Design a protein around this ligand. Structure first.
Ligand SMILES: *[C@@H]1O[C@H](CO)[C@@H](O[C@@H]2O[C@H](CO)[C@@H](O)[C@H](O)[C@H]2NC(C)=O)[C@H](O)[C@H]1NC(C)=O
Ligand SMILES: *[C@H]1O[C@H](CO)[C@@H](O)[C@H](O)[C@@H]1O
Ligand SMILES: *[C@H]1O[C@H](CO)[C@@H](O)[C@H](O)[C@@H]1O
Length: 336
């Protein structure tokens, strides 16, 4: 007795009483969240047809998950379409129109999301605040944003999580493919990132949680993006970044930085001066290869005095771009 919902109200009202849920071409009203947070433990949720959202300049989120032992999937041909170009104005979260957050995978545990297919989010696509979740074969296609004013269209923003396993994601966007602001035991593998800002740890600091530990980013590609591999920490803040592994990352058409690790962020931009309250230790880089554009820098490491240590750097083989003469306090295991 699968429950089939054709409206947001039906879902919100009835989801908790259902073990098998079908969300059939829901047109979510403007200014409302498609609220699935009261989903029954152990239930299955399937998206069918096109899920859409009415236009309002508000903060979202457009979709909110919640619960335990969930299985979330998409029917053949199904898509969750944010139709973000309605909001896009080249300013994203920094100005212009108020733009809603898209998908919150918050207050979720021991659940698997499979084949989630998303197009044109207003700003950031997925906010993850979860425990022991698998996010498999996602497609987050914000490629329309390149010519239609997309900005801050992050793939996965991760914070306050433990055990988040992303596999097989494809992210076409205008900002970070993934951004880990905090978390423990986070992995991203078999990913295809294009258009944006790369595979990022940070910015780290100034939040409720400023600890990143045990991150593995591997077997993935990053194309036509500002950065390949990145770790950013905030000037004069505290936290800890450790046990980070980048393995078998292939880059193409990188425009800014192949690998960039810097401890000098303030107000969303580099100051040029690092600080030492957010140590970055036990970082392994093993096999980062590919191509950089003419004005890109291969490697830029801007660490505080003593605040980056115990790095294991090998197989860094980049072609094109420039060599930095601005690196500071580079760990013995590494090189610009
Ligand atoms: C770092 O993260 C990995 C997960 O990315 C943790 O290892 C796993 O633990 C269970 C134990 O059976 C395995 O089934 C999983 O397959 C493991 N995951 C992976 C990707 O290998 C690992 O223990 C963490 N390291 C710590 C906490 O020291
Ligand atoms: C989802 O929406 C329903 C009605 O739309 C509420 O009753 C429920 O609390 C949740 O907000
Ligand atoms: C949600 O759906 C259930 C049926 O599964 C209804 O009983 C309820 O009133 C709401 O429509």
């Amino acid at each position: 007795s699968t429950c089939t919902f054709t409206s947001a109200s039906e879902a919100s009202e009835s989801i908790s009483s259902c073990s098998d849920v079908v969300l059939s071409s829901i047109e979510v009203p403007a200014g409302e969240t498609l609220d699935l947070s009261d989903a029954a433990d152990g239930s299955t949720i399937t998206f069918e047809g096109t899920t859409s959202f009415g236009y309002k300049e508000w903060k979202g989120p457009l979709i909110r998950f919640g619960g335990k032992d969930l299985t979330v999937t998409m029917a053949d041909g199904a898509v969750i379409d944010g139709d973000g170009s309605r909001w896009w104005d080249s300013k994203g979260t920094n100005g212009g129109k108020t733009k809603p957050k898209f998908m919150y995978i918050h207050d979720v545990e021991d659940s698997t999301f499979k084949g989630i297919n998303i197009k044109n989010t207003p700003v950031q696509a997925i906010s993850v605040q979860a425990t022991n979740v698998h996010l498999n074969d996602f497609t987050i296609d914000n490629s329309d944003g390149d010519d239609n004013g997309g900005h801050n269209t992050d793939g996965f923003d991760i914070s306050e999580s433990t055990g988040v396993y992303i596999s097989g994601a494809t992210v076409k966007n205008q900002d970070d493919c993934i951004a880990i602001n905090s978390g423990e035991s986070i992995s991203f593998t078999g990913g295809t990132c294009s258009g944006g800002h790369g595979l990022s740890i940070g910015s780290v600091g100034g939040r409720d949680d400023n600890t990143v530990k045990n991150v593995t980013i591997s077997d993935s590609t990053v194309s036509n993006s500002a950065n390949g591999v990145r770790i950013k920490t905030i000037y004069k803040e505290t936290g800890d970044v450790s046990e980070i592994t980048y393995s078998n990352i292939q880059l193409s058409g990188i425009t800014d930085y192949g690998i960039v690790i810097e401890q000098d962020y303030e107000n969303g931009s580099p100051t040029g001066t690092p600080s030492t309250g957010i140590p970055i230790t036990d970082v392994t880089v093993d096999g980062v290869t590919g191509t950089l554009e003419d004005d890109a820098t291969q490697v830029y490491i801007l660490c505080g005095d003593g605040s980056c240590s115990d790095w294991t750097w090998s197989g860094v083989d980049l072609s094109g771009g420039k060599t930095s003469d601005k690196c500071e306090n580079v760990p013995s295991g590494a090189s610009c």
